[model samples]
Target chain A: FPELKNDTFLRAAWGEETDYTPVWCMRQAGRYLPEFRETRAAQDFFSTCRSPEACCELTLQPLRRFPLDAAIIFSNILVVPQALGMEVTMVPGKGPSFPEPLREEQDLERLRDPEVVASELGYVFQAITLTRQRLAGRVPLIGFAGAPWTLMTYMVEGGGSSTMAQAKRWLYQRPQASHQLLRILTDALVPYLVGQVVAGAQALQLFESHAGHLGPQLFNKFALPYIRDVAKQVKARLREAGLAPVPMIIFAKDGHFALEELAQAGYEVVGLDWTVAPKKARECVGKTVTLQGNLDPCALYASEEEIGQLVKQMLDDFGPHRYIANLGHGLYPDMDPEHVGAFVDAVHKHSRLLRQ
Target chain B: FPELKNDTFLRAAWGEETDYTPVWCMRQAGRYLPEFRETRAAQDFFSTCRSPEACCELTLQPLRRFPLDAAIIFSNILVVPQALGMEVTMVPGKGPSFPEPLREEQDLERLRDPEVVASELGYVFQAITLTRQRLAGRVPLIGFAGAPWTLMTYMVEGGGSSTMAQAKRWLYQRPQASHQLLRILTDALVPYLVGQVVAGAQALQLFESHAGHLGPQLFNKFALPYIRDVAKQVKARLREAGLAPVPMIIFAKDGHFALEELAQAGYEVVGLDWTVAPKKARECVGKTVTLQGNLDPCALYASEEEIGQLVKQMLDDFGPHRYIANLGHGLYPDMDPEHVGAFVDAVHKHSRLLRQ
Candidate 1:
């Protein structure tokens, strides 16, 4: 690999000092970029995922357009479930759907053995490796998977849900079966995530996107344990393999109540949604962990100047230390690339200015 | 009008001591009840709201089924927007829709004068009056409207939205117009709410159902002022009319960051969603105001025995004084009526036991 040039995002993730807050956007290489749409037009969604070259190209597109401090490998969180023997089809506008969702304990028999999932997901590791080599070490690459509870939601509910009712019903009425599914997910994720590191990825994020649907009681039981396990097992396995463990970030999208627990859940960084106050979040997680994100993705709908102002305010709120700048969530499909550029530039400029 | 028989909900709303915590579910008389579906079968959603007899039957249905402390008149939030001259349709499975939603500043001209909205919604007033009379004071009838920010979301987005992107865009890209639309909503709601009280609604709730979509900054700027205005103006207008002002409840669904401000937003009671912790919520609102709500509605999916245990814990968290028991959000269409009965029965049984 070519000599690494930038480690700002990695350094920020490790709670080390940096000259400026490293900035990145979730879904940077998404439909918002016209080129991404052009590339996506060539093949269906999962087929694009299956091609290492396509994944490599998509992963690099955002880096070429903006001086983002980190490049996340292009992959969907649903891939872990798909690798576990569930057939997932992306229905144009409706998102990933499972035609035959797990409805009862008997349905668990349909899943592939957890031990074999890593081999099944070798394509993801290949994509990460190819994307990393394609980057020539310009920036660190991030690997991520859906946390157990979120993956279970898709597996049970079969698609994107407004209420996550079926999944929660599983927790309430079928506790043992729910735990069985979550454990299978955790077992699958550890190996999958470890494979990404072995493939030369520098960091990982576990996306608990559906965390808000569960309250403190339910989340503490069903979600948080697996979140902790994914970080713990992934690190331990990497150590057993004599590989360096990368910085892991747990981005629980609306899990505000779990911040204190999440900080203690064994991640290097805690990601936040825009709805949380930065000061309050800082108070919750204390001074040990690095914090990423929390500007509303919708804020990009404003003008370039307004985006700059909002970014400045976000930087001030998060401050300069132990922080990586990003939107509270992913960039929306309709967000202007120019405005996203404005967000990246402002974070770099204003975060540097704050040091003085 | 029948003489008052139960005022436990009213007393709790006023922060007064009660023998046991009062309980009422949001959408208590909803689709879960077989009788409600039967009553709703006669007309389309808006037509049902327009008919005092049908609305009265629906309102009284739940009271007959459970010993509920309050009955909310059966009506949709979109009625406020409909009265403003935008045509709305209930698309069966898809909830509400505004065919010609306010897309730009010029679209504001399509709205009817705000002063006349109360008259335009005379059917709702008539419904409240008939329902109150029919109740014979079995329980106080509660009335509600969508808060300005929430109503504007529907008016601009044209329906129930997952992201509320178009509405928030109007907030960012067209600030003046957003406020103008919000102000129009506030003007329409104040009279509409005041009329409900005059007709027979003993209390009111303002549902900021989309509050979570905006962060604290946007919510404070666009949402809080109108929330405050509605409370202040409603009370003042009622006093001016020589009618007693009813206690007001402000339920900002998932507005955790705005709790302190919401406590001071001039509402007598602050309602909460399931995502918030009760003890923490109590700490936020202080002892001056009452707190209502917040069990995860999904908890109903648990067994009846489990529902009893969950309700006990929920009651223990909020404690007994100055509180009301209810689900965090409304009942879902598929939720079993037996489970809802278990919830109501558990609250009544456990709450009285706590007092003893």
Candidate 2:
């Protein structure tokens, strides 16, 4: 392995004390940076993901601009669904859309065997390895996948939905099929995540972006068990393979209701959205796992001074221990890169001052 | 008024025990019904609100289909802004859009004086009166407006937003103007709500539909005070005019974080989104003010039997008294009216069974 460096995010994920809190934005290498857009215009979204060199460049872009504590391999969560044999297309202004979504149990036949997904997604592993080598132990490389329910939502609804009414309808009207799909996702994710750690990922984060739509009951039923299983099974697989299991972070956006359960669900970090108060989140999850995130990404729209003030308040609220500073969600495309720099700088500056 | 035949909704809103849980959906008189679409085809969205007979017929249409506990007068929250002199148009297939939204502080001059807003909104008042007369007191007429924060988001963003990124920017970047805009909205709502009561609306709901975007602090600063003031001043004004004050509801969609504050904010009922657990909501708000809502509208996509079971579980969690049954948000255009009928009937049947 390349000599490890700047492992603050990993240490923080493991609930270890550090001199300064680790900092990273959810979409740190995303379009908010002009250079990132130029790199992206080189190829279509998925084509960029398919190229290891391109993915390596995008992954290192943010680290080059700012001393971010980690580098997440540039890949879309939808790649897993695509690997499962659902055809998806990115509609220019709109987002990834699966034109022929899994609308019924009969549609389940169109999917590939979930067990073979890691093999189908070998490109992601290659990209992670390439990014790791290029970083040359500069910082930990983070790997991620969308949570089962969230990906399942995209598969069922055909695309991005403000309200996942059609998807939730699956939960209500065809629960057995919902569970079958969710379990297939869980099976796929375990091997895929294990493959990621095997490929040089130092840490993992599962993005449950659609958690807000499902209340506690549906989440516990369709989402949580699978969430708990992903962490559990991934760890077991890595241990069986004689690999040291990387720390896992579960970023359930708008999942305040599931804080307690998520804390107990065997992940080292429970990421929060902007709606959850850091103090309130702390109380909910207790002092066991590290808590990442929760500044509103929209806060980047504010002045640098205002961004600092917001960071100071957030840092103070989360206090100095068991903390990793990050935006609640990914930065928006229109956000100013300078303001994003202000955010990264503020977290580093304020968090250091708190420790001092 | 016309013999108070069905005050179940009123009694429940005041935290009084009822024979069964009173059921009404958020957008009961909406596009879900074929008749509503046909009626809507007669005119554009805002024009329908501007006609008393049109509003009355739409309001009564839902009541005709289901044995609902209340009849909410047909109106849109944007009308208050339209009355304030901003041009709003509802594009076919798209929702409301503001061609020129309130961007700069100087644009305040474009607005009608807040004091004269009620006079300018004579059509809504006329609709309220006409709906009440047409309803013949068979059910109470509920009136509503968007909360200051919600209205400000729509006005500031110019339309529907996935994330109110632009609007929240105003909060951090333009706090002074944000407060000024909020207070202006508060001033307009107080008289507008009081006018609804004078025109025979038996209940009022303030839709803080955008509450989920702001966490505790910003919501407290920008949204909660106006919410508090609207309830306070409306009650005072109604009393001064010797009219009985109607029960007030504050429905904050995805606003689980603000339950404690909203309960104490003086409304008779605090409405919840589907994301909140009913039992947890009951505990958060405590045992005083009434609790309305919180079934996932998508749950209606289930079979009628499943709908009944969900209702029983919800009623059991809520425990009947000081509770009204409603969808966490509005009925979707795609939802089955038969399923909506199933929802109302189930609430009535299940609540009766649970009480027994």
Candidate 3:
């Protein structure tokens, strides 16, 4: 109970000293686990995500079996597009599909309204509230939203993209219109995240899944500024509410070059994707902030014994302090749940000595 | 003729001092141009590539329209796999589809036998020779092959990939087998590229198109060393032939973190994909080696007025002395040919003033 109450992962997430690194996997709650699939068979993916009770049950599923340090509220990044009045749906096998894509400047006017998002996404805050209540201080709840540029990519392109050609065409060809979309998303995301904090979520993470696509120049102009604004707005809102600034982690998946810039951009933790060198990323981000992530999720497919060794190597590479162990990205659908179990156990068992 | 003979792009590729930068686009001879389509209509895509005369015609199509500084031979990177006995066909919209994919360790053994590659790939050398002759010393003819890891991905995955899941699974699960395949490729690629040099190619480039898949550890272990071997073997072969070591460029697309390692691995020129900051990359790799590239190709879809401004920005950001102007990536299939004309003109017109 003491270990649960004083979780090192939650402490490390808030930039506090911890005994051993706490580990969680991105997408730790879904399809890969049999229990998750069993539960999911009873409902559609969106139905589970939208319903507060179903969302809470799914969020806690992984933590029940594994000694995970935190419970990330189970949700999809694409939910923002749906909340913004876009006609978005996840086709059974085809991934997220949109019937009416925002292809032109005229499409911007329809989507650039914050009130619609605030109203439509009120259920997400309710889910976070319910999940936080269920955990009851056993572990902290991490709430997340897609960053402005990433959400806009899915919104503009109409779904998950392989090349992201249409979205980039819009941005490169019409910077003015792209900025307008970004500005609206930024306005919507700040209040949405603040609402999560108001509902008792202890931490917030910005998922910049598509941030890598911007390269450096366009990233600096488009992705970074809006992210900075989100962090700034969230902090100000928290302070105004007389709540201590909930620690912020900006996880820019596949964004390696901008790590140094992101470290300086006001987040307490920067999540390194599997592509970044953990030691180098730590050096870039420095000691004021903690580091999370970057284990290759594919390694989990190996034998449990090998998975343990891989987890140890990651912990050893990042060293003892200011590190929260997590996958560099999410786990694949086909990965063995038992292997993930061994991974979590090994992190807790091996990391104890390092911290001492 | 003077500008063509002393082309700064060609000079930079040769590691010679140049007053101005030379620029060209990757896939410069492909779908973006009307002239390329006209020539392509006269023959099927693979037939045109396989035919020395047709390949020569297609290779020069871009140079005739744009004042480009160099000409890359019109040949596919997958020709090595094709030679190694994989059946590769180009479907109009789908790209290269392989009928017999290298699935297991036994399949690797089949492809690794040197006699098979040598016997089957004589056509490629013939095409390179014809294209070099057709260039008539207007600009240096750059010969290329897929870097070992890239070819292995295509071979194992059976075609172009969105996730590169199967490739990484092999890499993470069976490191020894993957390394063996890479070793075989390194050995074959050395001679394949050397044969191009023997056939009249003036420069060589290794296209690591899927280089971005591996995170740093795997990249260093699997990708970098094999590429180093290819460069080393080619240089040694050039020394043995009593010819100067042709400038070797390693375009590890999206492997931005490996730039320093790539430069140290013995390439004369380091090509940056659009992701890396030009100034930072210069500092990382040092100014001794010339830097080519990296305007985002999507910028060509912008208006003519914007294209000049963006091109000028790249020139200013990179400076003209040791930089070669080119797209950070290949041209998209849907880009207007007129915009490409405007893009090339912008680079030529604005960059002329920056030359010494």
Candidate 4:
């Protein structure tokens, strides 16, 4: 492996001192960037995932335009469900959909055995490897997958839902089935995350995007256990393989109530959406895991100078220790690119300014 | 008022002790009932609101099926926006859509002065009076409106929004205009709510349905003040009219971050969604304000037995004091009426059991 040119993100994730707070945006390589749209123009959504070159280009496009401290491989979290034999498709304006979502216990038989998931998700590993080599070690490349609960949400709800009614109904009505499904997800995620590290990814993030859907009781019962298992099993497997394991981030987007438990949920970095107060989030997570994210993505809709000021205020709250700068959620397609550049620039410029 | 038969809901809302928890679901008088659909089939959405007899029957339909402790007037929040002269239409299968939304300060002139809004919404007041009389003091009747921040979100964003980006953009780019619009909403709501009370509404609720889209700073800036204003102004007016004020409950659907402030925002009751822990919510709001809600509405999608069991655990967490039993959010159209009945029965059964 090539010596890394900038290990700031990795250093920050490990709670080490860096020249400045390391910053990256979730979905940095997403639709808001023109180059990403251009590259993805000819391909259907999942087909774009099949081509390693396209994913590699999308990953590096944001890096070329801004001084992002990390490059996350361009891939969708629904890939595992797809690998498990759910037919996923992206509707033009509506986002991802599963035409035939698993409805009953009988439908569970249709899934491929979870053991073959990593092999089926080989293109993602290939994308990570190619992007890493293509960057020539410019910065760390972060790898991520949907956390078990979030993936299950998309799979069972058939797509994005304001309320995870169908999914939660399954939790109450079919407790054994819910556990069976969550374990199946946890088993697949373990090998797949290890594969990403072995394929040259420097860090891992588990996005529990639907964490806010459950209160503590349901979360602890169904979501938290699998979240713990994924981290524990992945690290254990990597250790047995004589491979270096990457730091893991668990980001429960609106799971503010689960913070104390999430802090203990086997991950080194916890990602927050903007709803949790920075001081409160810090207190909840305690003095252990690093914290990432929580700028309101809408703040970018402000003028460049306003974006800079908001970023500065955010950095002031989070401080420089064991923190990585990121938006509370991903960038929206309508967000101005220059403002995103400003957010990136401000984090670098202000954190270093604050530190000095 | 006639001698009360069931004042448990009113007592619960005011932090008074009761023999059993009072139960009522948000949207209890909604599309889940066949009788509701049968009545709604005769008219368009807003047209249904215009007919007091129709709204009266729908409000009574849920009580006929279940031993619900409160009766909420059957109406829509968007009627307030419609009274402001915005043209809103129900998009089949898609929910609400605004054909002409307020785009700029200049467009503000298109709206009638806020003072006339109550008269324009006189039909909603009529529904409340008619429903209360028809209930004949079987239970306290509740009336509601969208909070200023929530109504502004609908008017500015042209209906329902996932991120409220367009509305938040107004907050960042046009702070003064945002305040002006929010004040307009607050001004309109004050008289409308007071009129509901004078007409016979036994309780009031302000639904801040879009509250979660903003972070603390923005929420404090844009949402909190208007919420405080609505409560302050309405109660003062009701006093001026020499009428006893109804209890006001503020249910900020996803406003977990604003729990502390909402508790002190002048409303007597703080309503929570299922996402908040029963204990944590109690801590955030303190003891002065009564707490209402928050079972996951989807929990009713479970079997009747499961619904009963879930309600028992929920009541145990909330304890027996200063709590109102309700679903965290509105009932979905697909929900079974029997399970909702199960929820009501369980709350009464469990709370009485706990008190003993």
Candidate 5:
């Protein structure tokens, strides 16, 4: 438990010096780990997410085997929508499907009322409190929610998409209404994140999963400001409460073009997806904040020797001082658990050598 | 025919200024236009592509209604796969599907034989030649072929994909065999592109549509060098034959991160996807090479008034010289023909206003 207070991963994330780069994955606690699957076998996905004990068990499952530096709270981003009283479900092999999707401004009004959201989603905060107590300083717990734009895409489209055509079409056609939805999500996200921190979560991340859908102009106009709003509100809340502001990381997958703007948007750490070059990102974003990740999740499938080479390459690119070694995204369903073990061991092993 | 030889679009592509910016699209001749749909309703998708006269008719249809700068030869990038004796078909709404895709190193031998490709793909060259003859100096006829790595994705994956998972799995797992396929495609692409130039095509653009699939490292190793090789070979061949080397535009869509490396890779003009900011691209690539494109294709759905404002913004960003106004990618299937007309007229009108 003492190890959690001085966790090297949190130090690296906060831009403090460290001997080795601490490694964890974005969706570290989910599928691909057989034990996790076994624990949730009896319950449906959303059911487990709503249950405090079930969520706590799932959150700590990855750390039982892997020497991870942090355990992200086991919860779905779409819980925010569910909290807002939207009809959401995780169907078998089909992804999160919204049965009653928001198609108009009137639909947004029904889904964004704060009283309804806070009342409906008290269970998530309860889960966070329980998970943090169970972790008991074994490792810091992370709380996260999807960025406004990403959740809006799901809310409008009713599910996962290849092109996100319906969302973008709405964005282009009715920007005023789209911004209203974005504003609601931004306002909702702040208290949700602050509530998690109050409930014992140590850090936060905003998953701007679909940030790359729009071009640069539209991204700046629609996504960046809302992201900035979330970061600002959360930091201000922590400061006013006299609590240590949790280090915030914004992982905008495939949004490589907006790295500079994102760095200027008040987050203390920026997460790079596998496609971006870390060295180049370091140059663009500068060393003001820490840089976490850039490894392709697919590299986990490579043999031990191959995984070792990739870990060494990432260490060489980001170094250990202001970098936290992590997967650019979550582990895919078919990834070998042994390969993940080898990957984490490789990052720690080579990073120590490089630092020494 | 006189207008074709001194087309302002070709001049703009060559870094020569004109009265206004010339507007054309990547796949202007395909799917979206009412006339193209009419032509395709009379024939199957591949049949129209394989027939030289059908290809030429479709090519000329865009020019008849809109004051377009160039007419790309109406053909599929996967026609080369057909030339290599793979069964290719467009399944109504779904894209081109290759039933018996090449997966092994032994399959490389089948495509390595050039005579077979030349004989089977004669319709493409014939189409370019006939389309050029029919274009008759109205606008410069541009010929295109898929970049080697992109072609290999279709050959290996059997079709388009969300992740290009199998192609990348093969790339990471078996580097040597993947490189063998890339080499075969490169060898075939050189002659195929050169054949288009010889057969009356005035300009060449290599469509690296899937260029952004690979992260920076694999992109440099697998895709970039091959593109450079093809460009170098095509230019050298033109020099050896005493024919004027046509302007070469390398469009690596969503590959904005590799702009510096791409500019230095021997291309005379670089095409930008809508995702890139033109001002940043101009600064990154510099003024030595001409810059083409970068308007969002979705902007075509905006009103005539909004289209003018969008074009004005592009003109102001790019300025007049060393720029060609075009969509970042092709228009989507449901885009209106009247809107496309308004888009082209706006580019010409706005560029004139901006220059003044």
Candidate 6:
């Protein structure tokens, strides 16, 4: 791998003082960029993901446009479930769909062995290595997976859900079975994540995107333990391999209620959604872990001037040290690229201003 | 009205001691009951809502089955938008849809005069009156409207949205126009809610169903002022009419970030969703306001014994005073009626036990 150029994001993640808060955006290389659409036009969604060169192109596209401090490997969270033998297809107008979903306990038999997932998902590892080399070390690369509860939701509900009732029903009615499935997911994700670090990825994020569906008790019981285990086990495995472990982030999108426990869950960073107050979140997580994100992605619909003012206010709230500037959630498909540029520029400009 | 048989829910709402925590469900009169479906068979959703007799029958069906402490009126929140002159239709499996959603600033002209909504929604007043008479004061009959932000989301998005991005875009891009629409909604709602009390309602609940979509800043800017205005203006109007103001409840589903503000938003009760912890919520709201809700509605998917156990723990967390028992949100259509019975029976039994 080429020598790194910008290590600001990494330094900030380790709670070190940085010259300015490192900035990035989730889904920065998504459909919002016209060039991203052009490159993606050549192949279907999953097929594009299956090609390492294509994923590498998609990963670098946003970096070409913005002075972002990080580049996340382009991949889908559903890849884990697909590797577990569920057939997932990206429906054009609709999102990902599974033709068949797990409903009965007996349906567990359809899954492949959890230990075999990394071998099945070698394409993602290949994409990471290729993208890492392609970057020539301009910025750190991030690797992520859906947290076990989130992956279990996709496998059980078969797609996006307004209310995760079927999955929650499994939690309530079939507690032991739900744990069995979650355990299977945890087992799969550990190897999958460890392989990303081995492939030259510099960071990992576990996305508990559906955390808002469960309350404090259910989360304490079912979600938090797995989140803790994923971090602990992954670090232990990397140590065993004599490989250095990268920084880990836990981005539980709407899980404001679980912030206190999440800070102690062995991750270097805790990511937030737009709904939480920055000061209150800092209070909950204490002063130890680095905080990432929390701008409402819809704010980019405003003019560039407005985006800059919003970004200024956001940076003022999150402050400089132990923070990475990003949106509270992923950028939407309709967001304007120029406005996204304004967000990046504003974070850089304002953080420097705040330091003085 | 006949002499009141149960004022327990009303008392609890006013932060007074009650024999047991009064139990109700948000959509208690919904399709979970076979009898509700049978009564709803003769007409489509809005058509049945317009018929006072049909609405009265549906409202009373659940009361006949369980010893519940309150009954929410049988109507849809989208009626506020429909009455405002948008062409909303019940889209079978897709829920509510508005054929002409408000988009540009010019779309504001399409609305009917806000002052006339009370007259336009005479059918709802008639239903409330008829249902109240039919109940004969067995339990308090609660009237509700969608909070301004929640109604605006449906009016602008044209339906249920996972992101509420387009509606929020209006908030970011067209601040004055967004406020104009929200003020228009508040104007319509105050008169409409006051009229419900004039006809027969004993209490009111404002359903901020989409509160989770906005974070603290956006919510405080775009949502909270309107919420405060709705409560303040409604009470002033009721006082002018020589009607004793009924206790108002603000139920911000997934609005955990705004609990403290909501408690001080001039409502007697603050309703909660399942995502927040009971003790934490109490800490946020403090001692003055009563708290209602929040068992995860999915907990009913557990066995009857498990439902009892869950309800017991929930009641213990809230304690007995200044509390009303309800699900964190509405009961799903597929939920078992027997399990709902378990929930009600358990709350009644456990709450009384706790008092001892």
Q: How many clashes in each candidate?
A: 0, 0, 4, 0, 1, 2
lDDT of 4 by residue, A300-347 (tens): 999999999999999999988989999999999988889999999999
Cα deviation at A263, candidate 5, in Å, is 0.5
Off by over 4 Å in 6: B1-356
- In candidate 4, position A276 carries an lDDT of 91
DockQ of 4: 0.01
Best by lDDT: 6
Score each candidate by Cα lDDT. 0.91, 0.90, 0.82, 0.89, 0.84, 0.92
Angstrom error of the Cα, residue A190, model 2: value is: 0.8
Better of 5 and 6 by lDDT: 6
Estimate, for each residue in B79-111, the C-alpha lDDT of model 2 and write its tens digit. 888888889998878889998988888887787
DockQ for all candidate structures vs. native: 0.01, 0.01, 0.01, 0.01, 0.01, 0.01
* lDDT tens readout by residue for model 4, B1-356: 44457888998888898888999999988889887898799899989999987898788788767879988898899988899899999998888999888878887888878999999998888788766655556789888999998999899889888789889999999899999989889999999999999889999999999999999999999999999999999999999989898899999988899999999999999999999999999999998889999999989889988888899899989889989989999999999988888898899899999998
> Model 5 misses residue B84 by how many Å?
85
Off by over 4 Å in 3: A1-4, B1-356
Predicted complex 5: CAPRI docking category: incorrect
- Could you tell me the lDDT of residue B111 within candidate 2? 78
Each candidate structure's TM-score, on Cα atoms with residue i matched to residue i, is 0.51, 0.51, 0.50, 0.51, 0.50, 0.51
lDDT ranking from best candidate downward: 6, 1, 2, 4, 5, 3
Over B1-356, each residue of candidate 6 has an lDDT whose tens digit, in order, gives 54466999999999998888899998999988987997788789999999886787788778766779999889889889889999988887888898889999999999999999999899999999877765655689999999999999999999999999999999999999999999999999999999999989999999999999999999999999999999999999999999899999999988999999999999999999999999999999999999999999999999999999999999999998889999999999999998999999999999999988
Clash pairs detected, candidate 1: none
The residue pairs found clashing in candidate 6 are: A294-A328, A295-A328
